[model samples]
Target chain A: GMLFHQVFFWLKNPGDKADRDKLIAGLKALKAIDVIQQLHVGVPAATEKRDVVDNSYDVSELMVFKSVEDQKRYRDHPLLQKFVADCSHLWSKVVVYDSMSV
Target chain B: GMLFHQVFFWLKNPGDKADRDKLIAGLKALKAIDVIQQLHVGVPAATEKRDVVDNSYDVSELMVFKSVEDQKRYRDHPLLQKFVADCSHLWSKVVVYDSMSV
Candidate 1:
């Protein structure tokens, strides 16, 4: 099976709802791309005190690809470049984590 | 709006597939419990270098309750107690994070 990657983006100005909407729209555009199998974009909801952490990022993007090669292709694809260029500046911090089956 | 909680458990003997199966079964039972709006349990997938971290415990449980009170009740529920006692010993570590909509 192909590995899954979850990219985290902590928007510097998360309070600006308009910018968040724009970013989500940019992400939604990537769904039309071929290599991407699944894409889940959303904000986190908290239920306890432990939920908060220093390293926590506000917004998260989860993308699933058919294979590592497919993932690589998508990462380097033009659409991703356009999306990042259009919205990356809105966020102050970003971190990515990926994991696969053992 | 309801709060969300994500509980993580790292099985000490993860190689024991049977134990993993049992733990999943126990979680599936929670679906029948009242006040639980949603439950998602799964293993992580890898796709990048930064994915691996010491704080990254495995086996995550995402639960959504109607309210904080509901979550507290579910935590102390008798059936949940049984489930924990049955499988906690098989795991080396457990951690939970909760969040709510801002």
Candidate 2:
């Protein structure tokens, strides 16, 4: 089964473009990791506010790995480790939702 | 740009299957919203745990609309409103990540 590694980040200082640059740079750098088949990173959009929709997270990233094994390997890959080490400070809270494609 | 609406839910009592069904039913009910081009509902996968992976959420939904305006319309659509009103109690917290596919 294909694995989906979806994550949303709540930045401690989202207004700080310098910090955002660091995180974005690190995330883009992660595209180089061979374990992942796809990668995407983005910010919330300007949309109609509703009770059910919670647009609290400042940034989010999506990655697809071919298998559970590949995703597990990605967890400890040097590039991912470097990204977290370099950019973890920018986010105050991180929420991940790993799902299998059905 | 294509509109992406990604949402994750933290249930008040994730162990409650009845509540889970209520929420999932409500979510699947949302597929009826005419403005949305695509809809997907899922749960977190059993994957390797790490500092970055926060698998605390119980359920999640993804929707793709042709444009931001269509998504905005879907937000106010009766089906969506009904789903939220009927099932929001199942979850204690909701996090959404609205994005543009680039």
Candidate 3:
């Protein structure tokens, strides 16, 4: 089994691509971390209409880690914290979902 | 930017692919809804160890919807509700993050 980390961001300035770009750059930069098994960063898509779908989030980052230990290390790493410190003002809130599966 | 709907599932029985499979099957059943743009269901990867990584969640689902309105519709729709009614027992807790981008 492995640990999966999924994150969602709700931006106050949804229209600011400049900020979004900078954030994207920062997010993609996270790939440099050795522990991250898979890193995927993307924006929402334009698909069909539905009530269950939540389109309010500005961006999504899907990360794959080898184990719980690796994920914990990434959370405390300096670079990762710095990204949040630098980009914290851009988003109002963030929701995270972490899982371990076989 | 558009609407992104990403959801994560943490199974009570992490090793039980049977329940996971059923839940995944139940998840795929949602695609039948006309409003969902994209759907991805997956497990975590085995990589290195880091403090930043959080790998507690069992399963993850990433979805893209057309708009907030449509997403809300899907949430309220009967079929979607039934899925939750049917499968919610498998997880201990759930956290949701919603956003809107331009």
1 against 2, candidate with superior lDDT: 2
Ranking under TM-score, best-scoring first?
2, 1, 3
**What lDDT, from 0 to 1, does candidate 2 have?**
0.78
- Between candidates 1 and 3, the DockQ winner: 1
lDDT of 1 by residue, B1-102 (tens): 446565566788865778777777788788877878977665664443443333354565667677778987887798889888887777887755454433
Local error of candidate 3 at residue A82 (angstroms): 1.2
DockQ ranking, high to low: 2, 1, 3
Q: Residue B22: error of model 3 in Å?
A: 3.7
Ranking by lDDT, best first? 2, 3, 1
What is the CAPRI rating of model 3's predicted complex? incorrect
The digit string of per-residue lDDT tens for model 1 on A2-48 reads 45555556677866788777876788789978998877665655434
| Predicted model with the maximum lDDT | 2
lDDT scores of the candidates, listed in order: 0.66, 0.78, 0.72
State model 1's lDDT: 0.66
Off by over 4 Å in 3: B1-5, B8-21, B24-59, B62-102
TM-score of 2: 0.77
In candidate 3, what are the lDDT values of residues B14-96, reduced to their tens digit?
87878888888888888888888876666654534334444566667766666878887887789999999999888775534
